Design a protein around this ligand. Structure first.
Ligand SMILES: [Mg+2]
Ligand SMILES: [Mg+2]
Ligand SMILES: [Mg+2]
Ligand SMILES: [Mg+2]
Ligand SMILES: [Mg+2]
Ligand SMILES: [Mg+2]
Ligand SMILES: [Mg+2]
Ligand SMILES: [Mg+2]
Ligand SMILES: [Mg+2]
Ligand SMILES: [Mg+2]
Ligand SMILES: [Mg+2]
Ligand SMILES: [Mg+2]
Ligand SMILES: [Mg+2]
Ligand SMILES: [Mg+2]
Ligand SMILES: [Mg+2]
Ligand SMILES: [Mg+2]
Ligand SMILES: [Mg+2]
Lengths: 220, 106, 104, 252, 62, 53
RNA sequence: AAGUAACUUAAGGAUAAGAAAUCAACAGAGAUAUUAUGAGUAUUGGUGAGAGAAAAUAAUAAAGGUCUAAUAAGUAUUAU
RNA sequence: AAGUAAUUAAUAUUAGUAAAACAAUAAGUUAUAAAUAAAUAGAAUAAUAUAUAUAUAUAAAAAAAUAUAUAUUU
RNA sequence: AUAAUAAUAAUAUGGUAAUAGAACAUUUAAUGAUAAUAUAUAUUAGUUAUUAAUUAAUAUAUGUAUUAAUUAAAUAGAGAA
């Protein structure tokens, strides 16, 4: 005979749903688990209705603000990169840098990279890779570990569109026959960050034109 | 590259019912990314830790016995082999030890 | 060559049909009655002396220009000098940074 | 000294015989991988696939009228007190015999459940493996592959009957007769059959139509787990089987 | 679909598998009291387990 | 195996063919499965009632 | 609750909308409609009850652009 | 003649896959790091906390709190 | 190192509100032998620790169980309005 008339679920998968209002010996008899006679017995009071006392969403003062200007980077630890390298998944030709796009391709970072990647230092001891990295930013300790390894980090600015283009340049080419140009940092805070040598920002490390233009304006 | 290879290149030992894989022998296949299928699992609301071992081909009982022999420090009781899906559950977070034991062959 | 031309996107092809490249259209605003009147610029009507809105509204013009850039057919389109829009690499290069960027 | 003594490498290829259609004649072996055609028969996975498919299939046309749907007036039939009878509102109440249903469903009732794609693929493989084990998986081909024994003169390598549409002498036609002869030969007249084609074999389905109640001709893309398992003997094209294997292979 | 209680979201913020909140009784009438004693009320506070379930129900996407 | 099938009149399943590595094994299989059913038609395997005795 | 029920009026096989005085952010897109994600996010509330976008990416979709206007004044804008 | 359905959220059990999962058109959701109102900050300088990370504070420690580290990442 | 059944020793087995676990009847969908010597329904008397089903007799229908079993589900069980 066909298997189709002899298939069961795996043991522990299914259950019988508790069926109310269906006789006394059932257990869930006349009252059907409701108790006896109150508002909850025949009607609806809200779960978090605290009775009339000042509730736990009212006693306490409202705290903080939502920074809409915030753009949370996805964190990538050096440890994970090292592990990838050990596994022989970190496929890089000599000279080619491990950029955010490259990380995504490899599966170092996974899921949607909306705003960027920060490189943190959770396995800085056993990190020994002389490859060059490039991300939104890195932790100071992580940077130091990279330097020790014989590597080279560069914090690179990416607007959300610019980041997207970096991650998936072929899509833009398919759609429009042209990948979009990478934007300059318009914001003051961003400019300041990438102008820091301590952060290994690209504007100082590559000696950018924007920074020079700003200096000229300041002079004049 | 080809899903079904040609009749010439396939050896006799590669076929089913050859080399006696069913009788008292086993295999433990690695994951897609290429790691040992041994996992911590935090059941009953983080209260019950257990170590699960997946992707076992062939005789699971024999494999379990071999692992017990390798790791005498874990008790005999705490080795629940669920037969429907063929995976062997251990009580503690004994993942790393299991991996160490398996690596040399699988 | 003809087949390659035909293979061009629709909007661009339509533009070429109705404003062909044999006519050297003006860089500056002109009379609306003129033959060389640029469809991207606002041309003045000679009787009423009112600036007519561009024959190709600004979005459409921009799309046409981007299509031309894609297929390398820019110079056959009439000039977009006195329309304030720049595009892509030329825009990037020629622009001055904002006062806020240079002088916070 | 020896850590895992009984460790070993599993077998990876099962031979399926490639046949000519009208008469199921062995032309070649073809080694299909063990994962497709000889997986361990996990019933639970198979069950999951079947139930999900059944749920997807659901029409869900149950449409009993609730007290709103039901078409009485909203008027109070008897005044609250001073009637000498029980309290009543409008005539639509579930309590009364002509009134609408309590907790009434309303079509279209969506019964669609979800399954992970990998689980579904595994189930598909598993069903196929079970069929192979039973001896109910007839792979027909020989066009692409290199043969051992040559194809017969009156058979053909694809899954189809010749000159089915031709019908000159009598109302009876040849493809139907051939099919009947085939059924008679392999002792599967009343048995359920499942012809998994690659491309649309119009002549085959015409031949089948007499035995439409038991014979189900399906494409490579539209074939189901249910269809495979219900079948008493599946007749799959080699190319179609390859395609299915490719579809439901575990990715690496 | 379900939605967050906005007042509760304003009052409470996530901290791993709990919620943190501000202290009550430090907005006026602070003069006269001891400053050291008052310093107890300046910081934050983790949710009491009694109302944890309520908080979860209020904030389904936290 | 094809020759054996042709002479026999019966079909040896694909899985069986894959499994059995010798002519002797094939013969043994035949003796086990097909032969008794051929001898006695009431003893034969029925599809609708697979767990028959 | 809700611009809902209702009443009233007027049209067509559909109507409505529609080729940016639109979005966006120094990079760019490049019409309107419907759905999915974005997102119960920003936003807002006797800051209670509760209400809640857009950009962007996907589908569905059709050839989707095209002049018919001598380029628009009691109009934009302002106060209320 | 009475605990039903839809859209959601949180738990549990099993099953699939697993440092990834779902989805494969891209995009997204969850996980992979803990914090903080928020900010350009973020886990052993030579090992278990006596080290480190964050918030308060600070020259830097200490101090409260939570988190991170003892062939193989969870 | 399991499951079923059976022994021995021990402890436990009243229960409203409530919580948890396990079954059965009914109806539909998927798979599905069989047959008037059969099946279904009813009555009566037996049987099985028994809301259930089964045996026999009797009656009426039907050339026949969407039947046993496993799953999926429910307008799934009424002395209480
Ligand atoms: Mg009770
Ligand atoms: Mg009371
Ligand atoms: Mg009562
Ligand atoms: Mg009560
Ligand atoms: Mg279901
Ligand atoms: Mg005190
Ligand atoms: Mg309103
Ligand atoms: Mg219209
Ligand atoms: Mg509204
Ligand atoms: Mg105008
Ligand atoms: Mg105007
Ligand atoms: Mg006004
Ligand atoms: Mg400070
Ligand atoms: Mg009791
Ligand atoms: Mg009922
Ligand atoms: Mg009754
Ligand atoms: Mg009763």
């Amino acid at each position: 005979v066909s298997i189709l008339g002899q298939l069961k679920p795996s043991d522990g998968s299914t259950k019988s749903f508790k069926r109310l209002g269906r006789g006394p010996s059932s257990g869930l008899g006349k009252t059907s688990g409701r108790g006896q006679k109150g508002q909850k017995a025949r009607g609806k009071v809200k779960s978090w209705f605290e009775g009339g006392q000042t509730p736990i969403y009212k006693l306490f003062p409202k705290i903080g603000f939502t920074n809409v200007g915030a753009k949370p980077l996805k964190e990538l630890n050096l440890k994970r990169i090292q592990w990838f390298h050990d596994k022989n998944r970190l496929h890089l030709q000599p000279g080619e840098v491990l950029d955010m796009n490259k990380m995504r391709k490899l599966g170092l970072v996974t899921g949607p990279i909306k705003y960027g990647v920060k490189i943190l230092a959770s396995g800085k001891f056993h990190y020994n890779l002389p490859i060059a990295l490039e991300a939104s930013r890195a932790s100071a300790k992580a940077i130091a570990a990279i330097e020790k390894a014989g590597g080279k980090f560069t914090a690179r600015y990416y607007t959300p569109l610019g980041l997207r283009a970096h991650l998936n340049p072929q899509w833009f080419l398919e759609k429009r026959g042209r990948v979009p140009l990478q934007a300059r940092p318009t914001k003051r805070r961003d400019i300041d960050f990438y102008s820091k040598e301590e952060k290994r920002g690209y504007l100082v490390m590559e000696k950018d034109k924007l920074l020079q233009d700003i200096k000229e304006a300041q002079n004049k | 590259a080809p899903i079904f290879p040609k009749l010439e290149d396939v050896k006799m030992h590669e076929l089913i019912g050859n080399n006696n894989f069913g009788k008292k022998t086993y295999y433990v296949e690695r994951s897609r990314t290429g790691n040992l299928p041994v996992y911590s699992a935090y059941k009953n609301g983080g209260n019950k830790i257990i170590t699960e071992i997946r992707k076992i081909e062939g005789d699971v009982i024999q494999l379990r016995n071999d692992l017990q022999e390798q790791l005498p420090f874990i008790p005999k009781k705490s080795w629940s082999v669920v037969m429907q899906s063929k995976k062997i559950i251990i009580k503690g977070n004994a993942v790393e030890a299991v991996k160490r034991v398996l690596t040399k062959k699988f | 060559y003809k087949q390659y031309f035909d293979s061009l996107p629709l909007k661009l092809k339509s533009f070429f049909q109705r404003y062909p490249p044999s006519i050297k259209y003006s860089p500056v605003s002109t009379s609306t009655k003129a033959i060389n009147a640029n469809p991207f610029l606002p041309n003045k009507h000679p009787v009423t002396q009112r600036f007519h809105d561009p024959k190709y509204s600004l979005r459409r013009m921009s799309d046409v220009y981007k299509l031309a850039l894609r297929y390398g057919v820019e110079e056959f389109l009439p000039p977009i000098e006195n329309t304030k829009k720049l595009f892509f690499e030329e825009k990037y290069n020629k622009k001055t940074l904002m006062k806020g960027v240079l002088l916070p | 000294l020896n850590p895992l003594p009984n460790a070993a490498i599993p077998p990876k290829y099962a031979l399926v015989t490639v046949r000519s259609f009208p008469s199921l004649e062995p032309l070649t072996f073809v080694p299909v991988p063990t994962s497709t055609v000889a997986a361990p028969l996990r019933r639970d996975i198979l069950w999951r696939a079947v139930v999900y498919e059944n749920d997807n299939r659901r029409v869900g046309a149950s449409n009993p009228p609730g007290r709103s749907e039901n078409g009485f007036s909203r008027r109070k039939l008897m005044p609250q007190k001073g009637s000498g009878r029980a309290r009543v509102g409008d005539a639509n109440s579930p309590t009364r015999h002509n009134g609408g249903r309590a907790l009434a469903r309303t079509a279209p009732n969506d019964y669609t459940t979800e399954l992970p794609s990998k689980v579904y693929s595994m189930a598909f493989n598993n069903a196929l493996s079970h069929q192979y084990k039973s001896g109910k998986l007839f792979v027909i081909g020989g066009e692409k592959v290199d043969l051992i024994s040559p194809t017969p003169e009156l058979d053909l390598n694809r899954l189809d009957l010749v000159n089915t549409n031709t019908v000159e002498g009598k109302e009876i036609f040849e493809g139907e007769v051939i099919f009947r002869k085939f059924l008679e030969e392999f002792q599967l007249k009343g048995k359920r059959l499942l012809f998994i084609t690659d491309k649309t074999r119009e002549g085959l389905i015409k031949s089948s139509d007499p035995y439409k109640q038991k014979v189900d001709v399906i494409q490579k893309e539209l074939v189901e787990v249910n269809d495979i398992l219900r079948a008493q003997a599946v007749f799959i094209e080699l190319e179609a089987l390859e395609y299915l294997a490719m579809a439901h292979q575990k990715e690496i | 679909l379900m939605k967050t209680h906005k007042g509760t979201a304003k009052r409470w913020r996530r901290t791993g598998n709990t919620f943190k909140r501000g202290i009550a009784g430090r907005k006026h009438g602070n003069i006269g009291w001891s400053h050291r004693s008052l310093k107890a009320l300046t910081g934050r506070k983790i949710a009491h387990p009694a109302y944890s379930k309520h908080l979860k129900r209020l904030l389904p996407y936290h | 195996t094809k020759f054996l099938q042709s002479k026999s009149g019966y079909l040896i399943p694909d899985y069986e063919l894959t499994t059995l590595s010798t002519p002797l094994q094939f013969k043994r299989y035949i003796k086990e499965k097909i032969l008794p059913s051929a001898n006695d038609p009431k003893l034969a395997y029925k599809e609708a009632e697979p767990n028959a005795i």
